[PDB]
Design a protein around this ligand. Sequence first.
Ligand SMILES: NCc1ccc(CO)cc1
Length: 239
Amino acid sequence: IIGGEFTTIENQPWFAAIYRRSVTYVCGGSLISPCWVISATHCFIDYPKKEDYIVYLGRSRLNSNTQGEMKFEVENLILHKDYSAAHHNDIALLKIRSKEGRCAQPSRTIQTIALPSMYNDPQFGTSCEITGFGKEQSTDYLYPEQLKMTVVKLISHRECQQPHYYGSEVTTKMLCAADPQWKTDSCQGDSGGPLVCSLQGRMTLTGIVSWGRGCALKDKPGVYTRVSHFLPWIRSHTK
Ligand SMILES: NCc1ccc(CO)cc1
């Protein structure tokens, strides 16, 4: 995350830290249920084998072991079959189970986030949050050690559809978000992470970090996977 502020897992008890096996951080994720973490398909497309992944919950540090955190294996790695690298249908599901075979046990640093209602997103210009261990700066080589989160505003399709923006690269199955100043945003590493908005007075998983041109660049909104357009896929795939 470019800009924003640091936080701990307590303010994002539903965020998951996904890693892979020869050692290393892959992408953020969101716990939508006890055994299911939702993320982005572009995050696993190159290494489809569910056996090289570790998913932590209740974790606020990148290379440290946040006390209270839980480590899980990936019982299932479900990628959207209609994905295409700008990314289409950039949504993925990971069924978690630890070694002693258990799903996630809710607590103060681990909780679930509710999904939206079909085709229902906050009004445009609304403030939402984004969490991740992504770069704090485009030129940075390292990733922040502490978890980060910032605020961005929902942009209309018409607006993001423009050409000085992303033109046609963006579809109705996608959401754009940005600062009015373009000074804060999601960036490399933050993919798969949650775009949370309060809808009807309820923290809702409105989007999943998917892509964007650069980071915090003018007229270059961060694009997210519009979750309220994927519930049937999500429901059937978690049956
Ligand atoms: N390469 C990942 C990436 C994620 C997100 C944004 C949003 O700016 C940009 C880039």
